[PDB]
Structure 1
Amino acid sequence: ASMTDQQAEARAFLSEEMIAEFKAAFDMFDADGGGDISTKELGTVMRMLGQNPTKEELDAIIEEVDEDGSGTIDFEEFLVMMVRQMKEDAKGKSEEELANCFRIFDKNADGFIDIEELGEILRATGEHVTEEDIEDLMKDSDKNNDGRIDFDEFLKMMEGVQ
């Protein structure tokens, strides 16, 4: 996974209209039409496009793309950094949402989802689920056989691979 290789993969990850959209903002900081912008403006374009890198993350990227000291970042490297950030942010969002999902499922707030809680939420979806079906989910997800799903087990059940 070389730079060019990473760059190829960053473009395949986005739709072309998204890429053109990203470049239209990036171009407003170029001016010289060189295809690059100052590393001092990278945080601003990234936030303009919905990303939220921390200052340490910004520092780390700049050090990664500015080894020759030109003080600029080109568009292709920009896309790589944007896809890195997108993936990190989206994963943060999913984790957050799963913790919310669990507090809701765990009706009595004991820190566990029991079969009663599990059946109540699945039946409320409107799907025609049977008690068999609920009990099958419980057994497959209950890794330590204590009859309930803790948060770790929940994460594993939901993310599936996990």
Structure 2
Amino acid sequence: MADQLTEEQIAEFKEAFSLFDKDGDGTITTKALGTVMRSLGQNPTEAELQDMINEVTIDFPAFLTMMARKMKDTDSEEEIREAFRVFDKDGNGYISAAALRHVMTNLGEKLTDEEVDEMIREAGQVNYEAFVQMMTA
């Protein structure tokens, strides 16, 4: 999947990995993977290197897939931050239960307030951390 990866992000990844693809078939070795990770701006960890080796020789589309997975993780972190921030409608860290229920009823997901009534009750004013935990289950 690459929908998480943005057009600018995938273009930059392709530009960076064009050197690896210049070898003739895109078969990036461990050294090529290390250079690509260094050029990406973040040093890969041991777990990331092991995962890349297991998924591998590695390939330029495999590097694009890894970049897309990293972008998906970043988007998940951004969504967690948005859940922590926006759900605090009051802004003092304790959002009203009625306000939270009204916001949930008027949502794009078209969720049922009665169905999610138990989840809202479980979480007077629902804390922002409690709302984030309920959203993340």
TM-score using structure 2 length: 0.57
Tell me the residue number matched to 1:143: 120
1-side partners of 2:88 and 2:100: how far apart? 21
Which residues of structure 2 form unaligned runs of 5+?
105-112
**SS at structure 2 position matched to 1:33:** coil
1:99 aligned residue (79, 84, 88): 84
SS in structure 2 opposite 1:149? strand
Moved over 6 A (4+): none
Map of 2:50 onto structure 1: 59
CA contact (8 A) 2:21 2:27 kept: yes
Once the two structures are TM-superposed, the CA of residue 76 in structure 1 deviates from its matched residue by: 2.0
Q: Is the 1:46–1:82 Cα contact (8 Å) retained in structure 2?
A: no
Name the counterpart of 2:96.
Answer: 114
Candidates 14, 23, 28, aligned match of 1:23:
14
Higher RCO by CA contacts (8 Å cutoff, separation 6 or greater): 2
Listed as ranges, the gaps of 5+ residues in structure 1 are 1-8, 66-71, 116-132
* Bigger Cα Rg: 1
Identity of aligned residues (%): 43
1:92 is paired with a residue of what secondary structure? helix
* 1:144 aligned counterpart, secondary structure: helix
Aligned residues: 124
CA distance in 2 between partners of 1:154 and 1:24 (Å): 38
Cα offsets for 1:79-108 (capped at 9, x unmatched): 22222221112212322344355679542x
Task: Output the amino acid matched with 2:84.
Answer: A
